[PDB]
Amino acid sequence: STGSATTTPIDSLDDAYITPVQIGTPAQTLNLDFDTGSSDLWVFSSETTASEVDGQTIYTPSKSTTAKLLSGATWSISYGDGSSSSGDVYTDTVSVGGLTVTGQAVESAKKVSSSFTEDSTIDGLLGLAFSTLNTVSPTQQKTFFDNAKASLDSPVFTADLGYHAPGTYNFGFIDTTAYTGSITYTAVSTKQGFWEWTSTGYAVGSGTFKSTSIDGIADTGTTLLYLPATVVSAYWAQVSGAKSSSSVGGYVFPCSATLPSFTFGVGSARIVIPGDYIDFGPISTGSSSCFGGIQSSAGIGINIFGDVALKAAFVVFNGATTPTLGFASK
């Protein structure tokens, strides 16, 4: 089997991407944030505290004839910012782009933090990291990809995120028309539960490539590119007027600037992020100070190849017995 679904930016800045997912019988379609940095499939639901729902579509398990309460199971997640959610668990039928999993754990939110309530366009998350990170207790549950894997034509999924445009998540096959040149594969460590890999270095604009190992995670659920302070400083030094602002919480730059590209290494291959991918617009409405899309990872503890990086590539998440990651230009 295979699946193919379109993923769509939630706003004009590509802050996140939503992908429609069918849950239950009859289908209830929710727009989920596919997140390769986490491993829970959780949704706003009929059980979510009413005051914490503001526009989201909800999953109502009582209306699904294939929903079964997973007795005693709870979940609770705290993501890397300050956001959180928690609740109970059903198993149900879940389909993505024509690919169907029966008995998928669907984690129903009873509580969500304000940041999620404020995201009217995001009905929940679909985790695509390794199942070792799944938070369900007392019996950990598998991700959608792990459940589907054995049935797929090939044990892979791909992310093809658009810049200011829709893109695609494919399961079970490589669309050879979706990229240029070849796919360069690189080793993954699953020790922290992430799609963790090591970039071979970087260039800023037309500058010379710096060979240096940068360990980080491929994370579709993070908006920006978080890299070591030395690398980030080198990038922003090429933008006149750019500075790190403690009050704003990162590098900002004059909205009148032309941003240079940023290149990252994948083995001997090179992925080029165009300068305009690095613009996240005015820090507040009407401001002429703009927020940068490349930021320091120093306060995080890990480097993160988020959407800013990933949307410059066609990315293969290879779930073979020894997983690997593939990157192609497009």
Ligand SMILES: CN(Cc1ccccc1)Cc1cc(C[C@H]2CNCC[C@H]2CC(=O)Nc2nccs2)no1
């Ligand atoms: C990428 N820019 C950088 C920036 C930083 C500062 C100034 C400009 C630009 C940050 C950014 C903004 C947004 C969209 C916002 C929409 N309103 C509510 C807040 C935002 C939505 C949001 O953060 N949801 C969350 N859910 C869970 C955890 S956080 N998503 O990201």
